[model samples]
Target chain A: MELWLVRHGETLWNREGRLLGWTDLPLTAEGEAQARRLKGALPSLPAFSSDLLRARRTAELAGFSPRLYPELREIHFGALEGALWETLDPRYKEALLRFQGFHPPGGESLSAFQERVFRFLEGLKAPAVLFTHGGVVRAVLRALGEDGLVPPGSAVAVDWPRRVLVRLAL
Target chain B: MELWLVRHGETLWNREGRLLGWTDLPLTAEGEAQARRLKGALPSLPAFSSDLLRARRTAELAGFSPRLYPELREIHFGALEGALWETLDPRYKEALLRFQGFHPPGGESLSAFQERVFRFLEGLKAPAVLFTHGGVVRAVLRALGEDGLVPPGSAVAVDWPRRVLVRLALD
Candidate 1:
């Protein structure tokens, strides 16, 4: 089984160095261009996408009539959804970088996020495209012992929990 | 019996005309002066207070060794805890002024707040002083068919679901 996670393009908060979780901001112009590039770059497999507006729009631009899934969305950042990353507390910074002890105020934990992502991966039946967020992609890549974090609008295909097969950037 | 509600003194946000719900700010210098005025004013009854620091300190200044109760606390304002009252949307303003239709983001509904305040009131078995907040006082007053707003650091005594006795303030 193959799974492709596409981190949707530059959202309004993403470029501003804000943590964009669950807040439904629109894709920026550069974001749209990035998604447009995925048209011929991504596999022509059936696609699934997050229900958030940005993720949904990305799927449309990438030529996918995707089925919407909440689980495919980024981890809910709760109160810190649109908060600036620079001014964030070191406690949060360490938790995010170390990928542990990250229980954001009114937000979900990193372990909790991993559970959601890994569980969703277990349910996939075939090789497919998943239009999602940076956090979602990072969670998948990190769980499989790969470095998490990628450029906006890029994608990575994993061979069913074995290894990262490809990373497509435009 | 009788129950007294002592609204804690002016907070940092109170003078700024900001919504001071649940976010803990120390009593301003003016606020402490106001609480000091209550030192000799309150009755010598056993006291209960909101678990928040402001109300707890108000109880101490008012010469009462109060038992802390979260039920006696103000309506939790959640996300709008320190919001500026002047810049607030008319919808929130109207809801606040009219004393209904309020549900601040991630906060309790007016009805939910009333239930907590009134329910706490109903459980009082005898005359007592309760150091609390503006919203708590308002909830009690409104339920007794009276105006729901009062000055910061004021105290209101009621005949327990019957009538208002008096409202005390430092001039």
Candidate 2:
């Protein structure tokens, strides 16, 4: 199946390299413009988005009125909700960087998060566009054996449970 | 540029093998189902559609609210607007079969219609969803050096004027 994952535009917390979870922040101006740039870039398909304001707004600005799915939200960071990336404890930082062994005190467990996301993917019957979060994108890409790093407000397309197709930034 | 051309679902005229152009027909119930089946089969892109009712309804049923473009309509068949295909004069039949010559009187010339369609395609700056007619789908496919036969409620994706990418029909 063809799948497109669009990372929502920047938030103030994103600029500070903070771990953004279920805190519910808005997109910055640059974020909105980034979303607008996607207007003509994406292929028109079935679209879904995180129910959070940021992802929903990005979906709207990008010319899609996507069906909202709470399962698409970022892993709830709990105690680490706004922890700056650089200031993170190395155990947490290294685990996140490695994309393994991460179970934040109040956040969703890495294993659980991966299972949730992959289950959703397996549920898709056809091609779709998913407007979601950075971690979701990262989880997907890493699972496909890619580096999983993408600029905010960008997109990545993959052949579900298989290879990556294209990654679009700007 | 990436472009997808979706032929609207079956119309009563379509089932009757009539020359349907600019007559504005609605889709049959089966047609609506065909449109609905495309819900997750298509990619999310900027969308445009022929302003005709069948095309518009297909876009809506297929999970899109496309911007309307008159240029996307099927070629106006003029005096032959609703002529049944099997009963057409040899000349008209031959012309249509060959995709050339013999424009119907009071309707769009094949060349003029082609030019109009190409112009519209050229104006698209991004990959797009185009909900249009069978004739429009045929024109684009033939332009890309492919046989342009397609069923109603199906879609064909092309790499602009380059090549056919994929053709989709639910069943």
Candidate 3:
């Protein structure tokens, strides 16, 4: 099946470079505009999203009332909720960057998080649009053997479990 | 005394073309950048702002810990807090456009609102930065005999009660 993965528009926390996981925040005005523009750029498709407010709002602004799924959430940062990357203890940062089976206190393990994301993708029944997070998109792209950052309010179409096809930026 | 009047970074309502007054919303990432850029563009001065989230956040992101005042807020839209401009009642639109003493239900009268904003300005004892709403900035500009709109994350330096000094856009 074909799938479109989109990162939600930026939040205040996003601009601050905070670790935003499971913290509900709304899109900035420009973020909303980016999403609105996305509506015109993307083809119509069934939509799904992480249950967070940012993703849901992005989907809505992009003209899609997506079915929300918690499984699509970014990896929980545990005790590092809202922590700035620059200030994080090197140990925690090292573990996260390497995805070395490190789990933060009160957060999901890296392996478990990957399993949840892939499991959700495996259940998709058709071509769909997924309004998710930066982390989730990275996971998907990495799984397909690509490595790079996806800016917020951008999307990529992929042959699910295969290779990426096209990317759109607004 | 001089006053550097600034409009908050754009909010969702601003992008959606809604009449955004009194409803507190934060700036977009781009909005944040605008404010950040303002920090370098304007000279350092005592900063003040509307107590609203948008204004306050703008001030914060712009490198100021502004003294917040409610009188710096935009003209309240009352019951029309979130009304779309394209679809608003013509009577209200006309009155708003003309600045002709019209008041929204449960909102401040235009005259009263202007008085509130001006009163705050009258109290400023120093040349300072004022982070406020579009309406407040417009009122200040109009009082000085200028007519125009200032984009979000932008600033206008004025020789207060006189004329505009300079305008700056970050991008």
Candidate 4:
């Protein structure tokens, strides 16, 4: 199945270079406009989303109503939701610095997130398009068996989600 | 449908009180035993889980091969991972406090966690059992319409996962 993944349009935080770990902040008007423009470019297909407003809005603007898929949800970024990371209280920086080269604290790790996304992609039947976060797109590209992840603002048509080939099945 | 959420059995890190964050540590022998014990006590149903080794091992040992849902994975705890709470660098401690409701420097915030978990649980096929982390369970419980926050150790009824039923058809 070809997976069409799109990052939500630019938000106020995106333009301001603010961190948006997991805050439920709605899409800024520009973000919504981006979604509308992006959505206008795609062909219709069975769509899936994580159920967040940003994703939901993107899907809606893109002209495809999503079938919510819990497994496709974004990484749970504990403690860093709405605030910018640089100015976030001291705790945020400490968390990153403490585990340097390893992983994040109280949050899902790069490997762990990749593995989960890989597994979820494996479960998709086919002909599906996903509206997900940037991390998910990265994982999806990796799962597509393409070592290099497609940068943001791009999409792909893959044979299937990658987890099936890696023997990560239950 | 009722849901029973169980954090994976203790890993070496868990036993040592180290922050697991999202490392792929396998289940220790004791963890395996705990998982088997949990499986023996569980009521059967459709299952969902994180893709981590510990979570997968817990589900497999429990005799329930879950449907494997990544959305149920633990929250990312960027940067502050692995160090003890007390021994953490002073700067890290400052970031930890912001996490109660806000996002971690590279991690997600409580609200963002809730929103996605709410979406995840709401979209579930139902009458299912979820083998997940303490945080996933807590998120599911609160998302299902509970007031205030639900601690991870508290008794969460299976019926609760169904509370925050999702509204599927698009507008």
Candidate 5:
């Protein structure tokens, strides 16, 4: 099945480059515009969205009332929540960069986080559009062997467990 | 597989109770809204439609760029085209009422029309939504042993040759 994976639009925390996780933040004006533009770009299909405010608002602005799922939420940053990348402790930053055997205090481990996301993917029975977080999109791409980032309001289509099909920016 | 059969929205002839076949007609303003309402009611899947303007417009309004097929067109009314139901000749009216072995003068035979529509249904690879005409929907329903009428901008999902699933009227 094909999946249209979309990252939520930019929020105030996103503009500040803070590690936003589990915090409900509203979209900026430009972010709302970006979400609206997605209406014309994405295929018309059944949609699912992270239950977080950012992702839910993005889906609404994109003209879809999606079934909400908390599993689609971004990785919980724990102690790093709302911390700017440049200001993070060097040790934690290094651990994050390595992305191996590390979990922030009071947060989900990488393995556990991946399991949650993949479980949601596994339950899909047909082609769908997903409105989620940057981390969720990153995890999906990393699982597919492409560890790159998509911009806010951008979307990527993938043939599940196979390869990337198309990418879009709106 | 399953099929979601949809009748196109109201055209001028439709509102006038005229026999609209073959001739292309655009939808009215209310008809456009009816078509747009279909977006939420129907499953998002591959779509197909008759090549006629009304059906094509309905599919487009309902958020699908469907593959068009001539075989899905309404049974050609020929000489009865655009004639009001009350204005039809008595013999033709009686033939229509009987619903058996009848064909309009210079029009397609009823049996031939059913074959054309059934051929498209037999080739389906998966569930699909079809934007077609009243005649096509009636033919499909009749073939499934349920002869019923569906209103404009309405849809019925069926398990092809088995039974009807759900019907929706999108206002």
Candidate 6:
């Protein structure tokens, strides 16, 4: 299924680029402002969602009520939950670097991660907006990249929710 | 496939007994301490994912971030995202309860929500510790109920990360 893979707007963690892996960090005032702005910017579209406060709130502020996919939540960070990426152990950094294809300490690897991402998409009906993280959007795009599901960079951001096109896998 | 359904620890909303539907509230100090304890107590397990925040933190603290499955994130609560249940308009509650099987106003319903939980388990080859929210674990219990996958109540613990096993249909 095609998706509007939008990362949650800025949160306090987002502002600091903290390792907001699986912690429940809310959007900052700026984050809410971004969502409000994006709400006006968002076009009419179906939506899918992750349960994290940021993604959920962003989708709400963006003005689209998406069907929630428990599977679409952010990545789990294991022992690294809430710790800033800067404060993380070197082992995790190496793990994150290899995260594209490997699992982090308590998290899902990109390959392992993609299987589930694809699984979520398998039964998904087309023409949906997925209010999710950059990693998920990127993963879906990457899957499409390998399978030629969508055109290259078809995953571009638009006026907010308007960003990205809905494409289906062959 | 066996599943390790995990939930993030307590948060401000949790302590306040708020619905916490889809709002992005992080763990409180006690929550962080709980996570660290879980990290030390957890056993070696396969990879999993979260919605990129608390779930990830839990997974990372538990040393399971080797795999981050965005698909395994928590359910989105939309307009009801963080408002307290008691504080919500009465209309919203009926809408939310009736939404048991459908998406809540500004949120996902049990039907759509359950699919992701079920599908997430569909792809695993090894045991996975899913660091996520309470709802996710509850959904898993319901999904696995058909096959008697997990004991009632044993799979879910409001106090801490309750690790339970579920057998996959394909497996």
- C-alpha DockQ for predicted model 3: 0.01
Off by over 4 Å in 4: A1-170, B88-99, B141-156, B161-171
Per-residue lDDT of B110 in model 4: 52
* lDDT preference between candidates 1 and 6, better one: 1
Highest-lDDT candidate? 2
DockQ for each numbered candidate: 0.01, 0.01, 0.01, 0.02, 0.01, 0.02
lDDT (tens digit, per residue) of candidate 2 on A1-170: 57899999989998798999899999999999999999879765557799999999998899775767888898988899999999999999999888889998978998888888888877653356799999999999998999998888999998878889899988
Stretches off by above 4 angstroms in model 3 are: A1-170
Better of 5 and 6 by lDDT: 5
Worst 10 residues of 4 chain A by lDDT: A161-170
Residue lDDT tens for model 2, B42-113: 899989999999999999999998999999999999999999999999989977876656489999977677
Per residue, candidate 6 scores C-alpha lDDT tens digits across B1-171 of: 445566666678766767764566677777666666666455477757666566666666666665776566667777667768787777667644433334556677655665665566656666656676666665544322222222111223221112234331110
* lDDT string, candidate 1, B142-168, tens digits: 655577688888899988655689988
lDDT of 6 by residue, A52-166 (tens): 8888898888765666776787677656566787877777677555545345667666576667776886665323456777566666555444222222112333222222344
lDDT of 5 by residue, B1-171 (tens): 789999998898876889899988899988888899988788998999999999999999999999999998998988888889998888777756544345788888665676688778878889999999998888767545465589999999988755678888854
Poorest 10 consecutive residues by lDDT, candidate 5 chain A: A93-102
Report the TM-score measured on chain A for model 2: 0.97
Give the interface RMSD of candidate 4: 13.9
Report residue A74 deviation for candidate 6 (angstroms).
1.3
Candidate 6 Cα outliers beyond 4 Å, as residue runs: A87-91, A146-170, B1-171
Instruction: Kindly indicate the candidate among 4 and 6 with the higher lDDT.
Output: 4
Q: List the candidate numbers ranked by TM-score, top first.
A: 2, 5, 3, 1, 6, 4
CA error at residue A59 for candidate 3, angstroms: 45
User: Proportion of native contacts in model 2?
Assistant: 0.00
Q: In candidate 4, what fraction of native interface contacts survive?
A: 0.00
Clashing pairs in 3: A28-B28
| Span of ten consecutive residues with least summed lDDT in model 2 chain B | B94-103
